Amino acid sequence: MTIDKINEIFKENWKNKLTKYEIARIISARALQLSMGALPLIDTSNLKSDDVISIAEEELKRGVLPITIRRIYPNGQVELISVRKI
């Protein structure tokens, strides 16, 4: 119980889990930079759809993206989460 037990449960729950806003941000950034000329990190030969957003979704589902989320807590502590093969 740092401040309250509920806050500790909250921070323990979100320790190794991505929020929907982080997923949306990662997918949008990957799609934007993939439409600008980047090379896909997956096969992209037998995918159902060949648009950038679908490829970004598939690249996020199987961890190949070298992207890191930086969480800044209000007291200044920093947490880093990697989506590259977790």
Binding site: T2, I3, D4, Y73, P74, N75, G76
Partner: protein, 77 residues
């Protein structure tokens, strides 16, 4: 005049020790005046003898957790 701390609408108020208040403000990453305020002339603030610069620990009744803890900062007025 009259004792009101026993009313069913009034939660429990407690003055917080300086070390505990210091730890709280450090672990929240704030200044003391960024908490919700309570006046020194508040009817329940006077009942416990609270002076400005203190932090009051308030325990309210909740339908989700049973008991809930809240903190207020004593101001002048």
């Amino acid at each position: 005049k009259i004792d009101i701390s026993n009313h069913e609408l009034v939660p429990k108020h407690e003055i917080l020790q300086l070390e505990e208040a210091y730890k709280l403000v450090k672990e929240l990453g704030i200044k003391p005046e960024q908490l919700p305020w309570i006046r020194a002339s508040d009817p329940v603030a006077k009942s416990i003898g609270a002076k400005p610069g203190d932090i009051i620990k308030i325990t309210r009744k909740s339908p989700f957790t049973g008991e809930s803890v809240t903190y207020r900062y004593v101001i002048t007025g």
